[PDB]
Amino acid sequence: KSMNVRVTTMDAELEFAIQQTTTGKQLFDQVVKTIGLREVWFFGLQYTDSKGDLTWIKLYKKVMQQDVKKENPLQFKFRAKFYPEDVADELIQEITLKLFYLQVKNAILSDEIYCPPETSVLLASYAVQARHGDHNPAVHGPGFLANDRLLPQRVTDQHKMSREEWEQSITNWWQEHRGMLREDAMMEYLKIAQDLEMYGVNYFEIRNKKNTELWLGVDALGLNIYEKDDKLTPKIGFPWSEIRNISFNDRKFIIKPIDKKAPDFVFFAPRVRVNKRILALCMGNHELYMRRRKPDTIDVQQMKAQAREEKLAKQAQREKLQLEIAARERAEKKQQEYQDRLRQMQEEMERSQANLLEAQDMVEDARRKQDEAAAALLAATTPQHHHVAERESGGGDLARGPDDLVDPVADRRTLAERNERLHNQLKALKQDLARSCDETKETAMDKIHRENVRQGRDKYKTLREIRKGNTKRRVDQFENM
Ligand SMILES: [Cl-]
C-alpha cells in the first residue's frame, strides 16, 4: 500500500506518495532534490509520533516502521536540526540561506529566541528588504506592510506605539538598506541574529547529583550549563574539542573528557526519550564541529564555486527584468517551480526504472543504457557521506579532530563590537524606542539582558569566561551548583 505525505519547508509544501519500503533517506532526498538543496547535513524531517512526541526521521529505517502519527497525509516538517558555527562563512547556497533565515526569523518572531527591542526593529528592517526589495517612497505607501509580521509580541506589548508608528519606524531603517540584494539582507539578518545568546541552543532540563535543577545547552560550539532562572548567560561550558565519549543509561548521562586526568561530567535527565535526543544532538554537533576544524572537502569547495557563479547568473538575469515581482507572487512562483521539479523527478525516476528493466531483460548497446539508467536513479539520491552519522542505553566514542585543532571561540567577536555602523544603529534605535517604552511591561528576560549589557557581557566573552580552567575545575563547579 502507498501512503500520502506532506512535507512542509519554510517556503513550500511538497505532496507525494511513499511505499511501505520507502526509507527515511529516500523521503529526505525527494525533498532536497526538489528544492535543489545540497547542504544536507544541517537538515532533517520532524514529525509527531503516535505518543505525541516530536521526533526526527531516521534515514536508514523504513518510514512506515517509525511510528509516524496516523493521518492522511502523513505530516513532516523539513527543518534545520543543526546550525552553522558562523553563517557568513558556511551557508553556501541561496536555498540554504533562505531556509535558515526563515527558520531563525520565525524563532525570533515567536519569542523562541530572546531578542531585545532595538535589535528586533533592525532585524524587521532587513526582513522587509529581503521580502520586498528596495524601499521606494513613490511606490510603498499606506497599507503596503499591513499584513507583514514585524516584531515579537513582547516588543509591541511593551511600547506605546501604534502599528502605523511601527511601520514608519521600520521603514526609516528599511530606507538605509537601499541597493542591498535580497540575499544579502537575509545574510545580514543572520549575522546579527547569530550573536544572540539563545540562538542555536537546544535547552534541556537536567539535574546534577546533588539534585539542583539546571539547563543543559547543546549547540554548534559546545555544551553549556545554565541556572534554571537564566537562559541568557550560561555558567559553565565545554567546547566540543574537550569531549571524548558520550553515552546514557536510562536517566543517567555520562560525558567523558579528552583529558584522561579529568573526572566524568555526569547529569540526569527526567526521561530516557529526551536522553536519546540529547545524544543525537551532541553527536551531530560534535561531528559538524570537527568538519569545521578541517579543510573544505572536494565536494564543499565545488558547491561554493558553483554557488558563487549561480549568484552572478542570477544577477545578470535580474538586470534584464522590466517589472518587479511582488512578494506573494514570488512565493507562489517558487512553490510552482518545486511542484514542477517534483513531477519531473517522479517522471524521470519511473522512466529510468523502466529503461533499467528493459536493458536488464535484454549487449554493448544494452549495457550502456543500463549504466545511464542506473546513473540517473543514483542522481536522485544524495551522497551518504554528506549526512551526519546516525545513532534504555546508547552512545559511544566521538571521532577526535586534527592535531593542530584550534577552537574558534578565543578569537570570536560579535558583529556589533567589530562594526561601528551596526553599533551606532542599535544605539540610535535604543534611544528612539525609549521614548515609547512602558517600564512596567519589562519581562524577566528583558531584565537579565539589560543587566548583561550593563555589565559589558556578550555571547563569546561569556563563553571564554565559563570555559576557563581545566576540565576538572569546571566539572567540580557543576557538581557544586
Ligand atoms: Cl553515495
UniProtKB/TrEMBL annotation:
Residues 3-293 form the FERM domain. GO terms for cellular component: adherens junction; apical plasma membrane; cytoskeleton; microvillus; rhabdomere. It is found in: Cell junction, Adherens junction; Cell membrane; Cell projection, Microvillus; Cell projection, Rhabdomere. It holds the Pfam family ERM_helical. It is a peripheral membrane protein. One of its GO terms (molecular function) is actin binding. Residues 412-439 form a coiled coil. Its main location: other. The keyword Cytoplasm applies. One of its GO terms (biological process) is animal organ morphogenesis. PANTHER family: MERLIN/MOESIN/EZRIN/RADIXIN (PTHR23281). This is Moesin/ezrin/radixin homolog 1. It comes from Spodoptera frugiperda.
